Amino acid sequence: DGICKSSDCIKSAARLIQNMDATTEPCTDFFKYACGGWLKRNVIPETSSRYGNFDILRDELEVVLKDVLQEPKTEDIVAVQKAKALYRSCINESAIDSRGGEPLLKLLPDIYGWPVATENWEQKYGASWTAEKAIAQLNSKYGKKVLINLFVGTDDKNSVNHVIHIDQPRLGLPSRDYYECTGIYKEACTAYVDFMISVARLIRQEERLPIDENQLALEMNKVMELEKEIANATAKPEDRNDPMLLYNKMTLAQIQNNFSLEINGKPFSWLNFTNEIMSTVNISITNEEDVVVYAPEYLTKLKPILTKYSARDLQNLMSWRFIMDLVSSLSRTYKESRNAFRKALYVTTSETATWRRCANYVNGNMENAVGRLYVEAAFAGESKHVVEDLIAQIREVFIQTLDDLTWMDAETKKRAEEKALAIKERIGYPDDIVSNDNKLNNEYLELNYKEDEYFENIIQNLKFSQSKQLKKLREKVDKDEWISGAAVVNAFYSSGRNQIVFPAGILQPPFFSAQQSNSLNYGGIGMVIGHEITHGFDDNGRNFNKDGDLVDWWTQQSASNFKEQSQCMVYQYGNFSWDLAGGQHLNGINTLGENIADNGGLGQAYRAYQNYIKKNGEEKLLPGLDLNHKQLFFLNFAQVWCGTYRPEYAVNSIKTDVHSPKNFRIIGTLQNSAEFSEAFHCRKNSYMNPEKKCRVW
Amino acid sequence: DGICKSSDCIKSAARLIQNMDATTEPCTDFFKYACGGWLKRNVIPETSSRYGNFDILRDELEVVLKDVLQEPKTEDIVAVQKAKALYRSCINESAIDSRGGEPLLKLLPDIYGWPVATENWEQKYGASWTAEKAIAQLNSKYGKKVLINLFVGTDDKNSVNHVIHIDQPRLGLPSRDYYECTGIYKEACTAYVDFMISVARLIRQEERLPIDENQLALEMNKVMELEKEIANATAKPEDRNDPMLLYNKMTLAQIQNNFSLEINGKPFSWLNFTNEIMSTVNISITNEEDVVVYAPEYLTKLKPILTKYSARDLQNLMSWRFIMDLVSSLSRTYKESRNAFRKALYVTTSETATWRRCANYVNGNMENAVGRLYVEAAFAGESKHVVEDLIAQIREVFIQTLDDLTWMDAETKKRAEEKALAIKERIGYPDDIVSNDNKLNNEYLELNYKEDEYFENIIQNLKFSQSKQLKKLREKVDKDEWISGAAVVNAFYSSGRNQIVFPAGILQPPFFSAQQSNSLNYGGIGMVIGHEITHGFDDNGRNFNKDGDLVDWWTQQSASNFKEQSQCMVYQYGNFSWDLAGGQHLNGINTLGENIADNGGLGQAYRAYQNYIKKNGEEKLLPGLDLNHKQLFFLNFAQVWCGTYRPEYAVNSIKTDVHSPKNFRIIGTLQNSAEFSEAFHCRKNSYMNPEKKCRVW
Ligand SMILES: CC(C)C[C@H](NP(=O)(O)O[C@@H]1O[C@@H](C)[C@H](O)[C@@H](O)[C@H]1O)C(=O)N[C@@H](Cc1c[nH]c2ccccc12)C(=O)O
Ligand SMILES: CC(C)C[C@H](NP(=O)(O)O[C@@H]1O[C@@H](C)[C@H](O)[C@@H](O)[C@H]1O)C(=O)N[C@@H](Cc1c[nH]c2ccccc12)C(=O)O
Ligand SMILES: *[C@@H]1O[C@H](CO)[C@@H](O)[C@H](O)[C@H]1NC(C)=O
Ligand SMILES: *[C@@H]1O[C@H](CO)[C@@H](O)[C@H](O)[C@H]1NC(C)=O
Ligand SMILES: *[C@@H]1O[C@H](CO)[C@@H](O)[C@H](O)[C@H]1NC(C)=O
Ligand SMILES: *[C@@H]1O[C@H](CO)[C@@H](O)[C@H](O)[C@H]1NC(C)=O
Ligand SMILES: *[C@@H]1O[C@H](CO)[C@@H](O)[C@H](O)[C@H]1NC(C)=O
Ligand SMILES: *[C@@H]1O[C@H](CO)[C@@H](O)[C@H](O)[C@H]1NC(C)=O
Ligand SMILES: [Zn+2]
Ligand SMILES: [Zn+2]
């Protein structure tokens, strides 16, 4: 009868059936058609601002992590014993609750204290205090970047080396838009200072110091005034989206020349600051060091701001930025103060399960030890070969498509073919994490965890992570180093390494299974593969050559044509109105890169699917579904995107998110697909089938 | 090919496949075989002590309730407008948080205050205070039963009338076993007094009274000492399991004669107490009123206890018992004190979503308004006919089986056939809730909800619910009155009304669907129907005749044989060792009624299924499953029971739970089923197929 009746097909079919809304016309709204069933069943948990298929797979991944982390085993190597020990220190709330805020109080003097919670700060600290030393201590010891973000990273123009970088810092609130403190941000800004005041009060109460509410509010509203200024000086994301423009290499004496700063009446020294950081790792810095400035405008605007604030005003903000990230690792009363602030930002009334947060904390700090446990428990490493072949098919489809693009000249097509061939793929997990105990053990050698000392553990992890990073400066970028752990539900592209990464976490249904129909595999992981590859050729990635160097490989015409073809997508998405954000329009510019990758990716995936049919023929149909495989490809593509958002998340996320909302990632992509309209027999100018169709890749 | 390939079959098959563990031998452990897949995926949420298929359907039911309750609609009748208004008052935490504890402080004088949180209680209250008035006010106004449980209910020996009843009261902690306060109960007992002290402190703090921690601990440990005594005086559940023995009718002067009480040096008056309660509803009580005493031993043991405590000692416990149930309806700080106590009893680190608790609160107080919304949104009332026919088939199978039972004499089989024919069934929802707006509106007429006054709302609901109940005394039991709302995931048997109830909430997959295979329907809802019917013939129900009267219809021999046949199940279950409770054995006596119902129910369901095959033939097989329908019947029966428990829940629940743990409800029942062993080709004496098989029905 030409219908698949296997256990696998039945499982696939029930999933597709349950999620879709067959009472909707696919040519009217494919999001509702493909996801309407998912939406009616699912509700956003109280722990989340949004919920989708990512969150489902992530929640399930965490259950695997709990299972592998919770039980000590006889044959466990030291790296595995350390992850489990770290897990045990995290889940012991009784041990944590006992210490109160004592571990923060001990750490405080090492970061020049917190003026608001310190008595006679000027006499105790303000004597040996310098901006150079204060910022440097927070950076080198704890990896916390305030006022000035100094980091060691790959040189965009020489991908084999590391170089010192200077950029604008992250802010306490989610984005620079919050600092307006009116309308949708009023509550958050109020809750932000309220959180500062609450934390200040708890520390003083513990240290038995007099509490003046008037003074706490005065010192804390001044931190907010200082941060509001810093936030206004930061460049907007649209002013940072061009990598050629962002790159500004100069000497440390040149930085010292042009970017002068006066903190506490006395001028700031860029050479002392850098050595204060680099001495931590026994690295000498000359007055002739090359440094990439990502934010020259920000440093220029920073000078008139910093002259207006005292040592106390600055240290109050600097210490707060570190403290706010530590409160959750302390007792109940400290935790309760962050929960209230979280509730104000995200409209979430509950924190995630402690075991879940802990499994995630361990996975993030020990990605190789946890990744090994994950793959041994949940990933069939045999399926690395199936994906290896799919990546090969999609890479080939990208190269073949170059011929069919009219907007590029033969010379640009040649260089793009060069970049596409040089893409290195990373599938599942690095083989070494399973086969090489010595290398695994040695990565965590300097880490010694105590089961009753969670805070000591987290502070050690902050020190280790940052020491590793600073050490890399004089070193060459390691080729065999993975940009992601195995136990991650995501996929990535590195412009600097010209690499696509597919962690084991994403190589599972609905995206992939060597036992699921090929239409579902091409529709899911096949689109993800094209998405990641297309990232090497988007408004940001096209600026990097085959070796990951930031060099122009485009002719003046081909590049003007790229911008021309892209502009169609800018207006198409910028014309979408988001009902969860109150009908507010999408930012077509902020989301361009992702929209090019989505549109390029779905296109490349379907072609590869057609090519698979040419070579192998039609697959057996799925039972209980009155759809062919051409249609099932698009339905599975849309179902990987089933998701929803809180109206309060949407009103804010619309301005800064780089990915389009899920309904629009589905709508936008299929509106540009003639093959979608063919498979679904969409009448010309039906919502899903507009006459005009944007196309880049 | 004889295989069903419909959308419905595919959905059923994927559910069966996903939940089972096909790598387990069904004759070794059918729980693992049928549920192993369910267990690997699912984890107990932080809000729960246990999790199973009940919790899944309940969570999903709540999503329906949220959807129907949240949006006001134009065509809404007043009863519906009231449920939505009540819902809105419940979900407004800002309105709730604003009032602090003020609504409790206003209510307090009406219940003779709380001595520990009152200044000069003796001068302010102890002048007009009597046990008779204090207990009566808490009972009649708020429905709270302390020291003595006086209630109006159906007369076990005349099911058409209501009569006053006297029983032992409920305790503050989950059961009388907690009051040992050692071992597994130490933490709970400590957390219980800690909760009392915390609530006492918050009230004093609000009223601006001096806080002496030494005195709070002294007064509260005395409440615990008083409750420990009360708990010890209460009869054990094994001493209350025989309804003929529990029934003791006597006159109110006779109660006053034998059960004398001396509270605060002066003797207690059973006539003043009763009138103090019954005057609330304008009902006069004579000194010659007939009253059913369920706890004569408890009242006898109560006298030496109550003479040892003062007016203050008693009112401290009495008020606490009401206050502990109110704290969750107050602000953050009041809520936080209960959360800590909850965390100590249940090892739960988070409270359920506010919307969920609210939807449940509205459903419980307005079951007819919410039931109407539920069925209109989620239940196909056409499927009432399908279930009507299934109940008819199972009732017929029960009657036919009576012939085949060797342990009963023809005379008892005749009376059991009489009872079985007189069972009235209640399916889905009462038709009136949808078709009769006037009757619906009139049920809630005396209720007027204010959207900003949640507390006022809950206190009004306590008053209404209790006034209705007391009013029923001189009235006849209403025949057409349903024992459950429609929006409930459970099924019930009433001995007093001789009725089986199947709310719409249980008439959904995995139990039932007019579109799911008949083997799955008989295995699910068919077993539930037999379970409920068999309840009319268990160790408790067999004591009630066809009219719901507590009369002996058994011959001396047939009744001695019932106990003999039952004893097999007592030892079989009492020999099961529960791994989650540390290998502790099940209580074969506490769980007997449920085990008879489970064993009787599965048996009746399979026979009816066989009868269906005789009349209609073999159904088409399910795809992706290498099982026939005989086997699918048992797999679905076991899958309705997929569930798990927290070790901390199990160690306590094993001593008092009346239902066996889910694995044992599956294991115990199939060990007694020769048809299970036939369908699965189980070798004699394999774990699932013991040689000896217990049988009652
Ligand atoms: C094709 C998709 C599976 C992977 C794809 N990752 P990719 O855009 O290359 O990269 C993502 O966004 C970049 C801006 C960040 O730099 C990266 O760190 C990463 O977050 C993405 O859309 N990620 C989204 C959404 C997403 C992540 N994991 C998922 C799992 C299922 C469904 C959706 C997702 C995100 O990271 O926010
Ligand atoms: C056959 C079953 C669906 C219904 C069956 N109800 P039933 O035992 O007649 O009655 C239940 O227990 C009695 C002791 C109480 O008096 C009743 O109030 C009721 O709680 C039962 O086992 N209920 C269990 C478990 C349960 C309730 N709802 C479920 C839904 C799905 C799975 C299991 C359950 C319980 O109430 O605890
Ligand atoms: C929690 O921490 C305390 C403090 O050292 C310790 O006594 C206890 O064993 C810990 N609990 C677990 C489960 O490890
Ligand atoms: C940097 O400058 C300060 C000025 O206060 C001096 O104390 C310090 O020792 C210098 N440190 C390094 C590491 O260059
Ligand atoms: C919407 O579409 C038109 C092109 O049709 C474009 O010119 C316009 O700028 C777009 N609007 C937004 C808000 O991006
Ligand atoms: C919450 O309660 C306040 C107090 O009356 C009211 O102002 C507000 O409208 C309420 N919010 C909602 C969503 O009903
Ligand atoms: C009951 O007895 C008390 C004794 O204090 C008396 O005050 C009261 O009015 C009587 N009430 C009723 C309703 O019989
Ligand atoms: C277990 O089984 C035997 C019958 O074989 C019975 O006599 C005994 O009392 C049972 N044990 C318990 C603890 O119920
Ligand atoms: Zn992307
Ligand atoms: Zn039962």
Numbering used by the authors:
A (entry chain A), B (entry chain A): 53 to 749
Paper text:
Neprilysin, or neutral endopeptidase (NEP), is an integral type II membrane-bound zinc-dependent peptidase of approximately 750 amino acid residues that degrades a number of physiological peptides that are involved in processes such as blood pressure regulation and nociception. NEP is composed of an ectodomain, which contains the catalytic site and belongs to the M13 family of peptidases/proteases, a transmembrane domain and a short intracellular domain. The structure of the ectodomain is composed of two largely α-helical domains (domains 1 and 2) that are arranged to form a central spherical water-filled core that contains the active site of the enzyme. The larger N-terminal domain (domain 1), which is structurally related to the bacterial protease thermolysin, contains a single zinc atom that is critical for peptidase activity and is coordinated by His and Glu residues.
